[PDB]
Amino acid sequence: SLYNTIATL
Amino acid sequence: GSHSMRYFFTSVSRPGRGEPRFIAVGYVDDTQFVRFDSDAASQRMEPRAPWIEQEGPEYWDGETRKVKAHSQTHRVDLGTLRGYYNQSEAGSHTVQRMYGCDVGSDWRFLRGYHQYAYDGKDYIALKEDLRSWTAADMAAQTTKHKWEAAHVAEQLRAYLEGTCVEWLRRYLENGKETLQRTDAPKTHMTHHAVSDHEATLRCWALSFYPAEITLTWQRDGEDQTQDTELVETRPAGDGTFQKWAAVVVPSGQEQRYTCHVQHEGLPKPLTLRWEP
Amino acid sequence: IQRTPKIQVYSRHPAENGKSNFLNCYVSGFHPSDIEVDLLKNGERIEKVEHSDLSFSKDWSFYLLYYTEFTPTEKDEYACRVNHVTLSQPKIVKWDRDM
């Protein structure tokens, strides 16, 4: 299952 | 043995028209199990192994939602990076991201990782401790300071040590008949006369899983690398792998040479010798 | 910033003339990801070729598998033709059944 809270640059 | 779950993401900008190409792939060990391609018709995360097909609609809706969120992050990141490197709008550029987790033999968390690249070079990566970042240059250094103040590593660490491992264990169980099976290499040797006075012996390893393998030649019981060739491990297309190693020897001296095969699926390494 | 592809052309199974098999062209070690890969039968592009989803290695270089069903014979020549920004002309690697 993918990570739910990827941060942008 | 030990196991990993990994996700790989690639976005390529398309200046002439429209949005970046985005491709995401998920693996357990050396088995692809999911994909997303922005060019494909479904616009969903899709199954690529039988054992993931049993997951229900909630799963596929959530993975689709998350993967689209990843896609949009990569789209804005391409723009941010173009600005950081003072590049024009005219050229195509690439972001790559990989993350995931390893468990050891006893299924406990072993390692996590999260790495990001721009135009095929390191940009920023989480350190092994999952607590701080390795920034390759001053652009990435500004990313690091921002992500530090926003506690980005902490939230990623919680995923990597927790839910990543939990899902990995779930997939290993659901896919056990293949994911927890080793396929030992099927091995043989061929012989070809290269001139009047020399021959090539080629040691084959076929139909193995996982991909990791070592092939080595010995002469008179000592390792030999001169006059050898070792091809890179390649997929057969059916989920298994292939490799070979060859040595050139004086004709008539074939019996001095042995091929040694090491693989997780072998209780003991194999030794092959030319016997016809 | 540019890395040229490595190419291997091979069958899935040990080849026997007249028996159905799969012809593979494995391209790896390249950057950037845009690449053109065709499989050829006697010089001509094979239409029903598929490929793996783009992925990459530790060094960030890309790899792809291109493949098609085929039935080898004594006389039919197979090859893989690759074009990439690092190549001034398309590169043709011939299938050799002992490799």
Automatic annotation (TrEMBL), chain A:
Q: Where is the signal peptide?
A: none
Traced from the root, the source organism's taxonomic lineage reads: Viruses, Riboviria, Pararnavirae, Artverviricota, Revtraviricetes
- What's the protein called, per UniProt? Gag protein
The record lists the organism as Human immunodeficiency virus type 1 (HIV-1)
Q: Which residues cross the membrane?
A: none
Task: Please specify the portion of the entire protein covered by the chain, as first and last position out of its full length.
Answer: 42 to 50 of 79
Q: Which domain of life is it from?
A: Viruses
